[PDB]
Design a protein around this nucleic acid. Sequence first.
DNA 1: GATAGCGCTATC
DNA 2: TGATAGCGCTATC
Length: 327
Amino acid sequence: MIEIKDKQLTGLRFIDLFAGLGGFRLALESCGAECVYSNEWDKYAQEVYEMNFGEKPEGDITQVNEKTIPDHDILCAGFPCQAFSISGKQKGFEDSRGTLFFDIARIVREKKPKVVFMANVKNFASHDNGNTLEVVKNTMNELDYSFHAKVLNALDYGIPQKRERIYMICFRNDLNIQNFQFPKPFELNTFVKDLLLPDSEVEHLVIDRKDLVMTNQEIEQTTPKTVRLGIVGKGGQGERIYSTRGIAITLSAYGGGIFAKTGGYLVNGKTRKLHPRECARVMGYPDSYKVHPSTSQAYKQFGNSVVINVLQYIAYNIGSSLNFKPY
DNA sequence: GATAGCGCTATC
DNA sequence: TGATAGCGCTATC
Ligand SMILES: Nc1ncnc2c1ncn2[C@@H]1O[C@H](CSCC[C@H](N)C(=O)O)[C@@H](O)[C@H]1O
């Protein structure tokens, strides 16, 4: 994550729904905002959350009375995406884990925050011929909020990861906000290898399969893109080796393959998956962040989390707009 | 809970 | 296309 000297969000209080690791909290807190409520039902995520913020999020949101939610200016939510990802069986709202957005809708209806900050996967914008995004636009417009939506790639904001996500920002109409903009991308000067840990600490992650087929030459010069070098087995998800000289592929939460949830990388002549901490760095988390003791769970948590840096630039721009109030 | 083969989708 | 990539799915122990 980045350091922020002008706390555009000072004095403002927010809600951390579908918290997970608390990526949103880190981002809004670095801008001066105050977290007044957090919600996350996964036992393990809850443990990491406490392990890093002292508190334990509330259980199943679908069964929490919105009236209960503390007043807040900004509502943060990176709701479930298994139901909309390019990787899943796109059952959208028909999927049990696909209706959570409507829970946000009722939270908003009751609490009417000044801003609604949401995030989901890219395939979300086009899912079901775009009808899914439309339901969210109209549902938000019908609650009387503007709807600013856009897809950004982390590689465009200082983090070497091809993670492309859609960010939805909603302001309450009454407060006429018309200068809000998404962060302009800027050159990527950081690559996978710049974030790796010393070999002595990742020896155990080294994999060595006889079906390893290097199909491409290691790259000398760095690029702001993922560059496949080889493959293992059939080369499906988690069976592809990439260059640490390029950027990292999208981390996943339920992903499989020998290099499950992180992908394979070629480091000093060896083939291995990323270390939970390297994942953290890939997601923009400060090394001071305590990861969960269970690696499988840690990989999962970082897998469906958010890139703090990106979240920061948006959060900063949310404050810039909220603060511009001339006479 | 942890591990890992997959198998289909979207993009251009 | 043909090649690449995905907050995934789920069977097994
Ligand atoms: N009904 C429900 N109540 C609370 N959390 C839920 C939920 N259904 C799904 N979730 C949680 O939704 C989260 C989606 S992942 C969101 C990650 C988050 N922005 C971060 O930075 O970590 C998961 O952690 C999942 O456990």
